[PDB]
Design a protein around this nucleic acid. Structure first.
Ligand SMILES: [Mg+2]
Ligand SMILES: [Mg+2]
Ligand SMILES: [Mg+2]
Ligand SMILES: [Mg+2]
Ligand SMILES: [Mg+2]
Ligand SMILES: [Mg+2]
Ligand SMILES: [Mg+2]
Ligand SMILES: [Mg+2]
Ligand SMILES: [Mg+2]
Lengths: 151, 113, 261
RNA sequence: GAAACUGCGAAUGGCUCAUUAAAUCAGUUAUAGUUUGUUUGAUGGUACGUGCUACUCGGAUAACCGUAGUAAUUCUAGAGCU
RNA sequence: UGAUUCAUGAUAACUCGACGGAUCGCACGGCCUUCGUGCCGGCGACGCAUCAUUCAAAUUUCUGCCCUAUCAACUUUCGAUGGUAGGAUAGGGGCCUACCAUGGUGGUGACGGGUGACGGAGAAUUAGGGUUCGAUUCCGGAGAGGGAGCCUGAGAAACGGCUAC
């Protein structure tokens, strides 16, 4: 419903709200990472290419890539990964979270889109210190092996 | 009219101190304050600094008249600073103390960032 | 349990650590080190309890991370280091050497040494056998390993290890007729010259020993530790020359001590 | 120097005795029938070059900035640095 | 070595190789080859792999436990005892599979049943012999409301971790 607009080219972001069916029949039924042209998103987005990427809803449960069903399905995730960054969770833990599907549909709240088109000396010491002691290792060999060999 | 003697005395220049078990005898006297013992120990060891002394664990044996305890004479106040438990310094007033309240000493604060 | 046990409560701490019963719940729990943690003595028990150079846990921590303490000739910051038999502790601030030796009662003493009799240590060999590319090597009971060992050195023998060239300087062939200093069991501490060694197929081979003043005992091959070839040991024995004496005689010696005082 | 990323620990302690009668456990064996962070000691050729003494340096990422969902909680999406 | 086709070496190859350092600190200091932080080189930290060691564990051998026969037969299709071949495991092993054999235990008490039964060191009473007890702070085991299944990790079938009922 409510659009987040951000551009990487300038670095600026802001949020607006739309409520028009014939404006968003083209917004629906699309997945994460699909381009949308701003022609029809509103007469003052022409040329602007919006990218549907992200998007969470009311009850605050996000959309996840790869799950394609306009439901709120429960998934077992891994910490740090998409739609699961639980902190203080003893690495290797998994939780069964609630997520939305990846094809945008009616019951969301906030849809995120982005804009594609606007219409030393110490090291010098250490390298040869390593070379020095690795070569004294082999000199120590060629002493202390033959010392025993001669017997 | 009190006396003052030490025993079990050993000097370890590891922790740069001279450590003893003193065996004070104060017949008639109720007891002797540690402060009151400071000047006597200082003037019998000429430690050049009556603050290098830290004496404790006094008993006053059953029947009265004789008390024991430990004593620590440092040779640089620098070493007295560094090799000392935090509370004998506070007893001699060389440092001050603070108090705790441990609600979100760490618990609630482990939640936000 | 589900993993290593890292606390050792005070009453489980072995008998020869001499530490008292009511001083607290726990005991220093020697770290996994060069000595078997049942036949050891941690550095805290060395500093605090015996030498009294410190009076608490933290004070020994201060002693050790001043970098003052030395084991086998190299400084050691650990505080539950499992020192063992004939480990040398030097304190160069005090120019003072100890070599950690048993007494006849089975407890550790700190027998002092000079520098010439501190430059080296002494330990037996667990086993000599091959390694990578066919080079022989031996493994001691001290953890130490030696490569290219003197091809005469066998298992059960004893070696001296200088703390600068860090290799053999000599080795004593474990044999009848040279002195030992048993390091486990009831006979631990008692020095004495082997008179016999009997082997049994499939189990422990025992050594019969005599205290140079007559008394005779036996112990299996595990706890013998030959010191010197012949009667003369190559290490300065403690105050009582490794003779365990009856409790009656420990009474007579104290009577004779008081009657001349 | 706070915060955060990376590392380690959280498998110890602590409480209780529900289960369980050759079983757990005790003395004593065994591993040549095995795994072991670490501590301690030793150890370390050639990566291609047609073995003729080595031939060059990547973004993305937390904390931070900014923009949000939710009633919500160490619940959560996206943009921008390193 | 009591005992090994042992340790270990050599050789033929094999592997989409984990590995064989693109890491971090103070202390400055001999001397020009182009006098160029110049040729240098030490003391440490952290780390990677093999062996040994240490802290351990796991499996394990003999012997040892209370009352009950109104508990004299129990186990065996579906592992019960063994053999082989193999899989799985860190590893032995019916731990599992395929095939073959029909075995194993039992009046010296199997199997089952009771326990207001975790085992032990030990506690009370004790002339000797014994009788009763042992939840409990030391050791070993087990368990996290009941079960079951797992990830991270050297180590957990972990609950001051998760997944399901
Ligand atoms: Mg426990
Ligand atoms: Mg420790
Ligand atoms: Mg098999
Ligand atoms: Mg019960
Ligand atoms: Mg217990
Ligand atoms: Mg409950
Ligand atoms: Mg458990
Ligand atoms: Mg569990
Ligand atoms: Mg709890």
């Amino acid at each position: 419903m409510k659009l987040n607009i951000a551009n990487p080219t300038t670095g600026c972001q802001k949020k607006v709200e739309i409520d028009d069916d014939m404006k968003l029949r083209n917004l629906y039924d699309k997945r994460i990472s699909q381009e949308v042209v701003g022609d029809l998103l509103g007469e003052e987005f022409e040329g602007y290419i919006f990218k549907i990427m992200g998007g969470c809803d009311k009850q605050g449960f996000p959309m996840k890539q790869g799950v394609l069903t306009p439901g709120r399905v429960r998934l077992l995730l891994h910490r740090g990964t998409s739609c699961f960054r639980g902190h203080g969770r003893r690495v290797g833990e998994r939780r069964r979270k609630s997520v939305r599907g990846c094809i945008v549909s009616q019951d969301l709240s906030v849809i995120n889109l982005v804009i594609v088109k606007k219409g030393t000396p110490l090291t010098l010491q250490r390298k040869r210190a390593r070379i020095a002691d690795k070569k004294k290792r082999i000199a120590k060999k060629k002493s202390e092996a033959a010392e025993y060999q001669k017997l | 009219a009190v006396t003052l003697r030490t025993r079990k005395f050993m000097t370890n220049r590891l922790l740069s101190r001279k450590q003893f078990v003193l065996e004070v005898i104060h017949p008639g006297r109720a007891n002797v304050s540690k402060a009151d013992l400071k000047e006597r120990l200082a003037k019998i060891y000429e430690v050049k600094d009556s603050n290098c002394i830290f004496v404790f664990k006094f008993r006053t044996h059953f029947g009265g008249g004789k008390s024991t305890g430990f004593g620590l004479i440092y040779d640089n106040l620098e070493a007295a600073k560094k090799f000392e438990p935090k509370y004998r310094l506070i007893r001699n007033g060389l440092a001050t103390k603070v108090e705790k309240s441990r609600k979100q000493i760490k618990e609630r604060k482990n939640r936000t960032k | 349990a589900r993993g290593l046990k890292k606390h050792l409560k005070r009453l489980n701490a072995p008998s020869h650590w001499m530490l008292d019963k009511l001083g607290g719940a726990f005991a220093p729990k020697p770290s996994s080190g060069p000595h078997k943690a049942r036949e050891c003595l941690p550095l805290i028990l060395i500093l605090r309890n015996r030498l009294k150079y410190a009076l608490t846990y933290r004070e020994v921590q201060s002693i050790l991370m001043q970098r003052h303490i030395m084991v086998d000739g190299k400084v050691r910051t650990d505080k539950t280091y499992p020192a063992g038999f004939m480990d040398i502790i030097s304190i160069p601030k005090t120019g003072e050497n100890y070599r950690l030796l048993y007494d006849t009662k089975g407890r550790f003493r700190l027998h002092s040494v000079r520098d010439e009799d501190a430059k080296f240590k002494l330990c037996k060999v667990r086993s000599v056998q091959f390694g990578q590319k066919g080079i022989p090597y031996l493994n001691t009971y001290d953890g130490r390993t030696i490569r290219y060992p003197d091809p005469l050195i066998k298992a059960n023998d004893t070696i001296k290890l200088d703390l600068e060239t860090n290799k053999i300087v000599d080795f004593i062939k474990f044999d009848v007729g040279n002195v030992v200093m048993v390091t486990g069991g009831r006979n631990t501490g008692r020095v004495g010259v082997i008179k016999n060694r009997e082997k049994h197929k499939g189990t422990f081979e025992t050594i019969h020993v005599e205290d140079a003043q007559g008394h005779q005992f036996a112990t299996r091959l595990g706890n013998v530790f030959t010191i010197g070839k012949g009667t003369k040991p190559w290490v300065s024995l403690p105050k009582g020359k490794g003779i365990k004496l009856t409790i009656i005689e420990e009474q007579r010696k104290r009577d004779a001590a008081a009657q001349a005082a």
